[PDB]
Amino acid sequence: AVSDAIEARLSFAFMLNSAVQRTGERVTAEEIRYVASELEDTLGGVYSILSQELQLPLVRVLLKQLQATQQIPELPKEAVEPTISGRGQDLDKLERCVTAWAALAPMRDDPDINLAMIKLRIANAIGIDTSGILLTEEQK
Amino acid sequence: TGLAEDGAKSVYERLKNDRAPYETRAQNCAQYTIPSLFPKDSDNASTDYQTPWQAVGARGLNNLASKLMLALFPMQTWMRLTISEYEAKQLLSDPDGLAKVDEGLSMVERIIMNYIESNSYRVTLFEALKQLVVAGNVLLYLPEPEGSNYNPMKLYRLSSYVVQRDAFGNVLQMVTRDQIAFGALPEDIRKAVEGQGGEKKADETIDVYTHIYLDEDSGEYLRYEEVEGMEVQGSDGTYPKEACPYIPIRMVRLDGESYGRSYIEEYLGDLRSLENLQEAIVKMSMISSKVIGLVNPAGITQPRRLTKAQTGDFVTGRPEDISFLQLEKQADFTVAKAVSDAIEARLSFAFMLNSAVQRTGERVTAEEIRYVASELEDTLGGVYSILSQELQLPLVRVLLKQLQATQQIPELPKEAVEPTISGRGQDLDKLERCVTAWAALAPMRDDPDINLAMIKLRIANAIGIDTSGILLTEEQKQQKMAQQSMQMGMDNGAAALAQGMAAQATASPEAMAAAADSVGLQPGI
Amino acid sequence: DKLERCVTAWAALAPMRDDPDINLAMIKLRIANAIGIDTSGILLTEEQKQQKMAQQSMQMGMDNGAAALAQGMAAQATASPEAMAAAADSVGLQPGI
Amino acid sequence: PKEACPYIPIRMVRLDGESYGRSYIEEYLGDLRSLENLQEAIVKMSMISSKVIGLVNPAGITQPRRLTKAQTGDFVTGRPEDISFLQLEKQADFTVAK
Amino acid sequence: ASTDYQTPWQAVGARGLNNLASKLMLALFPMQTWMRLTISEYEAKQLLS
Amino acid sequence: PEPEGSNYNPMKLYRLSSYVVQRDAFGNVLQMVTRDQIAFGALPEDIRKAVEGQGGEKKADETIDVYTHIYLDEDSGEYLRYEEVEGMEVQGSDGTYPKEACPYIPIRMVRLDGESYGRSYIEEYLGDLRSLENLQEAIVKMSMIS
Structure with missing residues (x-):
């Protein structure tokens, strides 16, 4: 029972799920296992140092070595990179403002609501940029 | 000159005797949770950090530093720039210019999020939040860009800085201690070290100090770097009171002491008792682990035949002579377990982990009932609420100044200020709610009596969306x-x-x- | 909420736009009177x-x-x-051309 | 003015005509005072429990000069009923205070 | 060769390493486009129509 | 390494028994030394001219401790990189690696200042595994008397 308690408190320290090494006895069901996201957050603390140490210098070398072998266009001295865990933010913020504009579809004949402005407000609330956004x- | 306070190497030494209360707290306070996080700094390689007998402090720190990082700093636009709306109406021809200003405010709030993420500020703030849990009291320096190259920010976890503040909230003077090696020094400092005299090794370290004292007869700060010499002659910076690149962060604020406390020293006594149980349960299993064969010496069984026998030999003797020394404490192991399962239960709410394995558990508690996990979000809401003033606003007010000087941001016209809204948010939901109310008016487009021109204004008045771009x-x-x-x-x-x-x-x-x-x-054709 | 509730009551009057007997000009005022929404921007x-x-x-x-x-x-x-x-x-x- | 002053004193539960106000959690501060006195005793009962004392029956055979210096699996002289351990009692008392 | 590596009596460290090195690889380095190049947007507005 | 064409180009790692770095109490790296043991037939072409240039014949399979040295430069912020053999250099050596773009980057699990290397993640539970093996060693040995 001590060895089943030490394995229990190493299995959270490592990113494996709670598993066989008890009675187990899950009945713990079914939406309750969204607390597996607690393992993702504990995992989020692990690599957070490593994204600076590995994940950025591996790109800054390859952005230089591909310029010298001409396998990449010479990007003009002003573009930098985050290691976003990947857009991401460009997709979801575009996908969300479509559904808000899709709710304005039964208002195409309303003579009062400034639909030319509401589509700009949602484009202002959601942080999509602008100016390719409207006619x-x-x-x- | 004399520079009205002298000397900066001694301001660090007079006030190093004030860290020693907080420093010896944090050396105790990191000993119980995770010893690699805050060393005693009479520490080298090697001094291996023994893991604590309990692993709740190691659990409940990463599960609280990440849940502060996920709540303080989401991946989207956690700041926003409010323009003063009535002074924006006066200086501008309504209504198209007003949202055109808020596009420039939506311009800036994306560039800063493209500046924070592209300079690994997410990394050194998560290293800051782990220091703020264990020790509190970290200042992190945001250097000048000097170009669009890679520019991180350096932090100092209370063994490398000293501040002195008032019983009132404001800071008087700060001293930061670097140990930059001689080959790795900046260019103006190497002229001062050689200007002091004597050759140096390429790898010899140098205690490089700064001194960020509040100025005599002017409200701004003065900042000068020094070496063993007096200054470095690239020194003097006129940092204003509201925008200084050195900001000391503070877990739970207490007046009028110079530093701040930490969050997990408020349960450090309870971890100290929970390790003393978990040290005893493990040591009771080690007496258990030893297998001693107690032979009854008033019997027949000599183990001269028990050892040398093969797989299945027939041996002389009675089975009741050979008994084994087993650990007792059947009714005592359950006393020390049920208390240790009760102390872990009342630390797992103090930290933001969910109720979990360390019981029978026995959930049947299902399925909509776990909306009481929002009680952990509200308890989390009390934790960072001090920290949003101390970290989250001065980190923006520095970057709103430093990006103006390097021309990576448009010069915003002296009237826009920022809340750290946990992010609109209010601009989206209040627009999304008034659409659905106007969508219910869709079968009334042919009704000759209802003033639909007015009801759409009333809902725009009830829901606090502004007006005047709202209607034709x-x-x-x-x-x-x-x-x-x-x-x-x-x-x-x-x-x-x-x-x-x-x-x-x-x-x-x-x-x-x-x-x-x-x-x-x-x-x- | 008092504006949102009187919309749904007026939305039930939608199949009565062709009824020649019910004073729909008055029922929309009665619901605006029962629910305490004020009046006079309320109707044409x-x-x-x-x-x-x-x-x-x-x-x-x-x-x-x-x-x-x-x-x-x-x-x-x-x-x-x-x-x-x-x-x-x-x-x-x-x-x- | 009387209605607009930048210094306003806040007040948990109002009581007249004393100058200050009370607090909310002083209305249960007596009850916390009793609940700590239980939780102080349950933890201290687990600390007598935590100490592992080996009571050797001195009218027996087992000398622990052989029990300590023995290896992983040695055969040692003695009876198992001589070696008992001083365990915390209070089985039916730990449940009262819990 | 030879020095044979005796397996530890416990197999949690052998379990909890591959289950942590892969879950770092799956989280740091997904199969899609884990980096992206941000251009400085205001300096991109100035130098361009 | 450098591509030198669109052919197959992996990257070699060094797991702390083949390299040495030295960094400051400050975060930046001062000097790195990497140790190869490339055999004589498998050496690159410019290095074989230096080993033969040192003198004495070699076996086809004899290993050679090939070192690099990636020290931070005097009076300039860039790195200097030279390979060596038992001889002094190899005369294909000097590379002006800048501070922000060098092909040798030392990775680091949990960062600790101002020691030269980094710790590891699973040494933060290595004490606890040490106690959990001592139980699992005893349970198995109790089943063998059984």
């Missing part, structure tokens, strides 16, 4:  | 009524002459051959 | 409709009107083909 003055 | 104004519709007509004018018009020209372009077939020559077609 | 007043009846007509006036002369001009702008070359010169087009 400009001439443009129609 | 007085003129605003004769333009709109023309655009449906100019559409049908251009549509029916372009369909008229195209049926009009091409019908009479090809009739009495000599005209058909003449019409093909205008395009340039010869007689093919 | 006396005048208030001859303006509104004109806007459906001025829409169909501008719509049928702009569709009339655009079919009206462009049909007679290009007939007896010398007029077609004269019509293209008014825009500024030479003889390309």
Whole structure:
């Protein structure tokens, strides 16, 4: 029972799930295992040092070595990189503002609501940038 | 000159005798949770860090530093720039220019998030939040960019800095201690060390101090670096009171002491008792682990035959002579276990981990009932609430200044300020809610009685969305009524002459051959 | 909530837009009286409709009107083909098409 | 003015006509005072439990001069009923205070 | 060769290493586009139409 | 390594028994030394001219301790990198690696200042595994008397 208690408190320190080495006795079901996200958050503390130490210098070397062998276009001295765990933010913020604009679909005949402005407000609330976002003055 | 306070190497030494209360707390306080996080710093390689007998402090720290990082600093736009709305109405012609200003404020709040993520500020803040749990009291320095290259920020975890503040909240003076080696020194400092005299090894370290004292007769800070010499002559920086690159962070604030406490010293006594149980349960299993064969010496069984026998030999003796020395404490192992399962139960709510394995458990507690996990979010909401003032606002007010000087940001016109909203948020949900209320008015587009022009204003008044880009104004519709007509004018018009020209372009077939020559077609068809 | 509740009660009156007996002009006032929403921006007043009846007509006036002369001009702008070359010169087009 | 002053004193539960206010958790501070006195005793009962004393029956055979110096699996002289361990009692008392 | 490596009596460290090295590899380095290049957006507006 | 073409180009690692770095109490690296043991037939072409240039014939399979040295430069912020043999250099040596882009990057599990190397993650539970093996050693041995 001590060895089953030490394995229990190493199995959270490592990113394996709670498993065989008890009675177990799950009945713990079914939406309750969203506490497996607690293992992802504990995993999120592990590699967080390592993304600076490995994950950024591996790109900054390859951004230089591919310029010298001409396998990459010479990017003009002003682009830098995050290791986003990957867009991501460009996709979800575009996917969310579509569904908000899709709710404005039964308002295409309403004479009062400024639908030209509400589509800009949602584009302002959600942090999508602008100016490729709407038809400009001439443009129609 | 004398510079009105002297000397900066002795300001560090007078006030090093004030860290020693907090420092010897944190050396005790990291000993119980995770000893690699805050060393005693009379520590080298090797001094191996023995793991504590309990592993709740190691669990409940990473599970609390990450849940602060996930809550303070989400991946999206955790700051936003509020312009003062009434002073924005005065200086501007309504209403299109107002949201055009908020696009410039949505411009800046994305560039900072593209500056924070692209300089690994997420890393050194998570190293800051682990120090803020164990010890509190970290200042992290945000250096000047000097280009669009890679620019991290260095932190100092209370064994490398000294601050002195008032009983009042403001900081008087800060001293930071570097140990930069001689080959790795900056260029202006090497001229000062050689200017002091004597050659140096390439790897010899140098105690490089700074001194960030509050100025005599002016509210700004003065900042000078030093070596064993007096200054370095690249020193003097006029840091204002509200924007200084050295900001000392503080877990739970206590007045009027100079530093702050830590969060996990508020349970460090309880971990101290929970290790003393978990030290005893493990040691009771080690007496258990030893296998002693107690032979009854008033018996027959000599183990001269018990050892040398084979797999299945028939041996002389009685089974009741050979008994084994077993660990007792059946009714005592359960006393020390049920208390240790009760202390871990009341530390697992103090830390933001969920109720878990360390019981029978025995959930049947299902399925909508676990909305009481929001009680952990609310207890988490009390933890960082001090820290949003201490870290989360000065980190923006520095970056709003440093990006103006390097021209990576537009000079925002002296009137925009920022909350750290946990992120709109309020601009999205209040817009999303008034759409669904206006969507219920859709079967009333033909009702002759209800003033739908007013109800859409009332919901825009009840929900606090602002107004005046919200509705079509007085003129605003004769333009709109023309655009449906100019559409049908251009549509029916372009369909008229195209049926009009091409019908009479090809009739009495000599005209058909003449019409093909205008395009340039010869007689093919 | 008091605005959101009176919408759903008025939404139940939607299949009664053709009933010749029920005073729907009054029931919408009674629900606005029962639920404590205030009044007087709540309903179209006396005048208030001859303006509104004109806007459906001025829409169909501008719509049928702009569709009339655009079919009206462009049909007679290009007939007896010398007029077609004269019509293209008014825009500024030479003889390309 | 009387209605707009930048110094406003806040007050948990109001009591007249004393100058200050009380607090909410002093209305249960007596009960916490009794609940710590239990939880102080349950933990201290686990600490007598934590100590592992080997009571050797001195009218027996087992001398622990052989029990300590023995290896992993040695055969040693003695009876198992001489070696008992001083364990914390209070089985039916730990449940009262719990 | 030879020095044969005796397996430890416990097999949690052998379990909890491969189950942690792979879950770092699956989280640090997914199969899709784990880096991206941010251009400085305001300096991109200045140098471009 | 450098590509030198679009052919197959892996990357070699060194698991702390084949390299040495030295860094400051500050975070930056001062000097790195990597130790290879490339055999004589498997050496690169410029190095074989240096080993033969040292003198004496070699076996086809004899190993050679080939060192590099990636020290931070005097009076310039870039790194200097030279390979060596038992001789002084190899005359294909000097590389002006900048501070931000060097092909040798030392990785580090949990960072601790100001020691030269980093710790590991599973040494933070290595004491606890040491106690858990001592139980699991005893349970198995109790089943063998059984």
